[PDB]
Amino acid sequence: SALGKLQDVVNQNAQALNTLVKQLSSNFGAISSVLNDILSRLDPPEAEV
Amino acid sequence: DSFVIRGDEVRQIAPGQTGKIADYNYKLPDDFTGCVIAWNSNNLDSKVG
């Protein structure tokens, strides 16, 4: 634990990037988190929503 | 734009609709602005034969 100050910064940056990646898997109330599934399953009037 | 359609096909004269009338006869855009006015003309456009 001698170099914990640099490792904390590295871990915070990597964990923030990982959280920003994992936010793509959330649908945020939509039917799916994948744009291709929405564009292939629905017409553009509801796929727009 | 004036025409004559079937009674239960007035549902299809709207943006984003599907059917024989919307897809093959009269397509409205998704960004349509205007008014769709319809009325029964059975006493004018129907004959006994």
Side-chain angles (χ1 to χ4, degrees):
Chain A
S1 60
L3 288 174
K5 293 186 68 38
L6 314 174
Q7 195 64 63
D8 278 321
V9 177
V10 172
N11 286 357
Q12 282 168 12
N13 286 309
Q15 184 177 2
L17 278 177
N18 284 340
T19 301
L20 188 71
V21 167
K22 292 289 179 66
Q23 281 297 98
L24 288 176
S25 71
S26 289
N27 47 41
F28 305 108
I31 62 170
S32 186
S33 61
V34 183
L35 292 173
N36 280 349
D37 290 334
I38 291 165
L39 285 161
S40 62
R41 279 167 59 175
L42 292 181
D43 61 357
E46 278 74 48
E48 165 156 356
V49 178
Chain B
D1 314 328
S2 64
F3 46 87
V4 167
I5 61 171
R6 187 180 295 275
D8 58 356
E9 299 186 326
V10 185
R11 188 258 303 163
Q12 313 185 13
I13 317 292
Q17 292 305 293
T18 49
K20 297 292 182 181
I21 298 287
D23 298 343
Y24 300 152
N25 289 266
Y26 187 80
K27 181 64 70 177
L28 277 184
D30 310 274
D31 56 278
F32 173 65
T33 308
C35 295
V36 171
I37 312 152
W39 68 100
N40 178 271
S41 57
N42 184 69
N43 43 18
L44 294 181
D45 296 319
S46 301
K47 288 182 316 213
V48 60

